[PDB]
């Protein structure tokens, strides 16, 4: 049973939404990426000078989420819930505000952590004033399923609301489980993707003490260099992204025009190390291969891989080996974190949206900063200008601390 | 496609482990439940008198996790990671330390929040001493997939390590997803269940300010009264629990004796309110119905329901309606939170283990404190003494804030 042999129903992507450091409008982000734009800038936040942080660069959203939030939203939701509400409404409107059967409608939204600012706020309030200063809303704002639950309540989803957490693969893992929910017959339509918090001092300190972050502060747009010989770690770039997926039958019955097909998904784990990927890429390549088995594709069918490509020395080398293991190392490769940075729990969902746009429009944007090939890598990294083609099938990769490997196989509609 | 019709492979439970407020030994917890024991006591923690907390009752683990941990693990793992390492090693030993194929072995472990004490710790450290005082291990201890990832690394699981977060249904949801992973062909064997943090002052304040908790401080063992007319909210009782599931042919091949069969799982959502269950019980009933459809059972086959039964007024009334919607209201009902209290992200896993032991041993423990029947409930609540019977099929219910409904259908082996 595969998508190609009709063992699974055909599942299509019928709407996308994202907010990024380039634009709040996904179509404008996409045009910016194709024009070689970067969302990364010097950080001007007072927290950078307060703490004299070693990292002084990153991409805040172009259009801050809270400029769209009312007084009560700011007091009743954590930041990732507010992002989830903003994007869920935008996605539904982009889909034509369909009146779907709530009992066949699921939501699957990943995030790295949850409403953690409300944990530190509640802690401070109780230390200063005692237990009765904690909000009656604290639990529901903090719980990591909070953003998915807000979207499910907002949009009326009664076929399940799920939150897989797998660190930096959470946003792709969510789209994998939404596809599973549909092909298993538990839903006909799902909103899925990932949301994440903004850049702040404590997140920068924690990842900096792992020695995982770029410190190329003098040239912020040049700092994120996935697959490049001179890379020196990742750069934060804020985002959130959701997509609407549904059976092809369901889309046809309501007149939705698909953007792409979501053909299959593979999830594996390394059992190697908690915070470094296995150098051999074997289990990561097996997640890619499993997505092909469930799609009914061979590796030679894959015209494009949207790489997780964080720009760490270790991570990019492992992913290049994984792509080789899966037989996909003659695909054209894009590493979007070169322009958009790393949004942790959201980023797999953002990069799945970009993989969809590559299939819809026949173009891969250039990987920024790809100037000096690294002989360990040996991939067809698209650089300098966009790569045009009749792309038929593509894989999006995402990986996370914990050893999680997620691959999603998409096709042109 | 159902378990009964052979459309899904047969999946069996081959080992269980749990630590509770009654015992660290699940067989002793089980004997204690049957004897009418309660794990709930007056809280003697200094934090109760420090804050003059309204809630002064709960069940700490009989044997603290950290009596088994050294200072190095106590500094380099969060508490839920330490609980997961302790339980995962105990489970694997109980299973006979099998040499399974890593590439066919998955882990699915839910939790409500994650390594949140390390969030407030890192915040305090940075406020006192700057960003370079944050631990280089802080991210991997905080991330909510951390416990599942520790277990996956410890035991060698390469077929996926998943953490579904759905608040108080997370422990059951994890078992649901592990069953899906096996029946979809991505694993032959899985460790699954849930872990959760201990009772502490800030968790008590947050839930207390929801007005959800019992304050029957005078008579701690009498406080948790699921389905009783005089119930007044839930009581914390610490736990963590894991089970080993595997295909029946994998169990046979290694000579493992099954404890029970895991036949099907249903997940739905309410889209009603963030922290109140839908009064009609309709979507929660449909999670039970879905687990029967995938099992290949009818409601008339069900002998036993292990209720989520938190002892809130509105919660138990909605669940009674859900059990009626599913046609399961002739079954014998147990509410284990009456004795063990509520362990949040672990509790659905704990109660799945108890459902397995009910089928294995042909006995349901008494629901403690069930003294005055409530006309809105109208269920056969087992009480007073344990009830012996030839139980063949049981459903375990769990629900969570966000409107999450999970039902698991188990059978006697
Ligand atoms: C692309 C970035 C991704 C970062 C990913 C981090 C993961 C979670 C990020 C959650 C942060 C949400 C912050 C939103 C609210 C906000 O902004 O509040 C500022 C004031 O600062 C704060 O309250 C800071 C509160 C910090 C909360 C605790 C963060 C703990 C971080 C860990 C120690 C390290 C990261 C763990 C990641 C684990 C999961 C992924 C592997 C404006 O305040 P005001 O002036 O308007 O009053
Ligand atoms: C059955 C209870 C379930 C409760 C579940 C609630 C969530 C669990 C969160 C994990 C808590 C782990 C605590 C382990 C370490 C420990 O205990 O450290 C104490 C000292 O206290 C602390 O550091 C407390 C640290 C507080 C951490 C933040 C807690 C935030 C809680 C939220 C405001 C409210 C709950 C949100 C739940 C959302 C998910 C479920 C809906 C001994 O110190 P020492 O003797 O070693 O010196
Ligand atoms: C098991 C550890 C893995 C997969 C680590 C990666 C490559 S994932 C990721 O997103 C990332 C960074 C630093 O962003 C990694 O270092
Ligand atoms: C949508 C909200 C739900 C399901 C609420 C429940 C009944 S679940 C649970 O575990 C619980 C408590 C207080 O423990 C609830 O109040
Ligand atoms: K990618
Ligand atoms: K239960």
């Amino acid at each position: 049973p595969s998508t190609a042999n009709g063992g699974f129903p055909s599942v299509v992507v019928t709407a996308v939404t994202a907010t990024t450091s380039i634009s709040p409008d996904i179509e404008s982000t996409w045009k910016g990426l194709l024009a070689g734009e970067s969302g990364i800038h010097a950080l001007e936040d007072e927290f950078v000078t307060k703490w004299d942080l070693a990292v002084k660069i990153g991409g805040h959203l172009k259009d801050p989420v809270d400029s769209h939030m009312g007084r009560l939203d700011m007091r009743r939701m954590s930041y990732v819930q507010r992002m989830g509400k903003l994007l869920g409404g935008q996605l539904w409107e982009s889909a034509g505000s369909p009146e779907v059967d709530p009992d066949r409608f699921a939501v699957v939204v990943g995030t790295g952590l949850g409403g953690a600012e409300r944990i530190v706020e509640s802690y401070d309030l109780m230390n200063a004033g005692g237990p009765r200063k904690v909000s009656p809303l604290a639990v529901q704002m903090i719980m990591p399923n909070g953003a998915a639950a807000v979207i499910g309540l907002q949009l009326g989803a009664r076929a399940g609301v799920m939150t897989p957490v797998s660190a930096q693969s959470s946003g792709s893992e969510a789209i994998a489980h939404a596809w599973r929910q549909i092909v298993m017959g538990d839903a006909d339509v799902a909103v899925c993707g990932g949301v994440e918090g903004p850049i702040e001092a404590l997140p920068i300190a924690a990842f900096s003490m792992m020695r995982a972050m770029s410190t190329r502060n003098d040239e912020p747009e040049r700092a994120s260099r996935p697959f490049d010989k001179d890379r020196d770690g990742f750069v934060f770039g804020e985002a959130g992204a959701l997509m609407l997926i549904e059976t092809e039958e369901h889309a046809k019955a309501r007149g939705a025009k698909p953007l792409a097909r979501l053909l299959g998904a593979g999830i594996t784990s390394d059992a190697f190390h908690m915070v470094a990927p296995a150098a051999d890429g074997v289990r990561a390549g097996r997640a890619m291969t499993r997505s092909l088995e469930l799609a009914g594709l061979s590796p030679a069918d894959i015209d494009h891989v949207n790489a997780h490509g964080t720009a760490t020395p270790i991570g990019d080398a492992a992913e290049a080996n994984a792509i080789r293991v899966a037989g996909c190392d003659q695909a054209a490769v894009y590493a979007p974190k070169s322009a958009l940075g790393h949004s942790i729990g959201a980023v797999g969902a953002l990069e799945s949206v970009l993989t969809v746009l590559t299939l819809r429009d026949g173009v891969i944007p250039p990987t920024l900063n790809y100037e000096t090939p690294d002989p360990e890598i040996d991939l067809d990294v698209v650089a300098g200008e966009p790569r045009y083609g009749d792309y038929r099938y593509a894989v999006n990769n995402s990986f996370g601390f914990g050893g999680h490997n997620v691959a999603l196989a998409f096709g042109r509609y």
Side-chain angles (χ1 to χ4, degrees), chain A residues 10-15 244-249 251-252 256-262 413:
Chain A
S10 172
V11 176
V12 290
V13 178
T14 52
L244 183 67
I245 65 174
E246 62 201 273
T247 67
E248 191 170 351
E249 257 184 12
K252 181 188 166 157
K257 156 63 165 229
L259 310 174
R261 299 174 177 285
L262 171 55
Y413 183 75

Side-chain angles (χ1 to χ4, degrees), chain A residues 42-393:
Chain A
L43 295 181
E44 312 272 8
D45 305 80
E46 190 52 49
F47 63 70
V48 175
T49 53
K50 173 181 199 188
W51 301 109
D52 194 19
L53 295 175
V55 165
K56 303 185 193 290
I57 53 173
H60 292 289
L61 293 178
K62 181 72 190 165
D63 182 19
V65 166
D66 290 348
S67 67
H68 292 93
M69 294 289 131
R71 293 184 186 210
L72 295 171
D73 291 331
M74 289 304 307
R75 288 156 178 82
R76 297 180 181 186
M77 281 185 283
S78 58
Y79 177 86
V80 290
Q81 284 174 320
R82 297 194 299 266
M83 180 183 274
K85 183 175 170 184
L86 176 62
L87 295 180
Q90 290 171 358
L91 182 70
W92 211 242
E93 172 169 348
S94 287
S97 302
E99 284 179 354
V100 303
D101 177 353
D103 296 345
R104 298 297 298 165
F105 173 25
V107 167
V108 187
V109 174
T111 194
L113 184 52
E117 77 280 18
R118 296 303 194 184
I119 296 172
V120 308
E121 180 190 18
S122 294
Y123 178 73
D124 282 346
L125 286 161
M126 177 168 179
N127 284 328
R132 291 202 56 85
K133 296 307 176 182
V134 175
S135 176
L137 303 177
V139 175
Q140 73 197 75
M141 292 191 294
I142 287 169
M143 67 191 187
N145 55 305
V150 161
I151 296 164
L153 187 53
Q154 157 187 47
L155 303 181
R158 292 184 167 157
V161 170
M162 299 177 282
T163 299
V165 296
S166 52
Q168 301 98 325
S169 53
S170 304
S172 278
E173 197 185 354
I175 294 169
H177 291 288
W179 175 80
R180 295 174 174 188
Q181 187 89 334
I182 292 174
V183 304
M184 283 197 85
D186 287 79
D188 298 325
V189 49
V191 166
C192 50
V195 294
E196 189 54 83
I199 292 167
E200 251 287 344
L202 182 57
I204 291 171
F207 286 93
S208 292
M209 290 303 298
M210 303 185 71
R211 284 87 183 186
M213 298 192 75
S214 177
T215 62
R216 198 196 290 281
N217 293 144
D218 59 335
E219 297 177 298
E221 53 293 325
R222 299 188 72 191
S224 185
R225 316 176 67 85
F227 300 117
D228 182 79
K229 196 170 194 185
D230 297 321
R231 65 194 186 271
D232 77 320
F234 78 89
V235 176
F236 280 134
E238 291 177 16
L242 301 173
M243 62 172 56
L244 183 67
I245 65 174
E246 62 201 273
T247 67
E248 191 170 351
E249 257 184 12
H250 187 276
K252 181 188 166 157
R254 75 181 185 83
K257 156 63 165 229
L259 310 174
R261 299 174 177 285
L262 171 55
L263 302 168
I267 301 173
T268 66
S269 51
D270 281 358
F272 171 66
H273 194 277
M274 186 71 57
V275 295
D280 65 16
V282 170
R283 294 312 299 163
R286 172 67 191 150
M288 296 181 79
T289 300
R290 177 63 163 168
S291 80
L292 302 187
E293 291 175 0
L294 298 169
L297 298 169
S298 67
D301 291 326
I302 299 310
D303 290 325
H304 169 49
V305 171
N306 185 304
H308 189 62
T310 65
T312 66
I314 287 165
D316 293 357
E319 182 169 17
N321 280 340
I323 292 171
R324 273 187 282 290
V325 166
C328 289
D329 52 314
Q330 310 305 332
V333 169
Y334 172 42
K337 294 179 180 59
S338 63
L340 290 174
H342 202 330
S343 44
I344 313 301
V347 78
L350 170 62
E351 295 175 354
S352 291
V353 168
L354 298 180
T355 298
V356 166
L357 299 182
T358 279
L359 289 163
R360 186 195 71 190
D361 287 351
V363 62
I364 302 164
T367 300
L368 300 189
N369 301 315
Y370 187 73
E371 291 165 358
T372 310
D374 176 342
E376 303 206 325
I377 295 308
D378 202 24
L379 295 173
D380 178 23
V381 179
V382 173
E385 56 285 321
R387 184 84 62 80
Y388 292 95
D390 186 32
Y391 303 114
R392 310 159 291 165
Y393 299 105

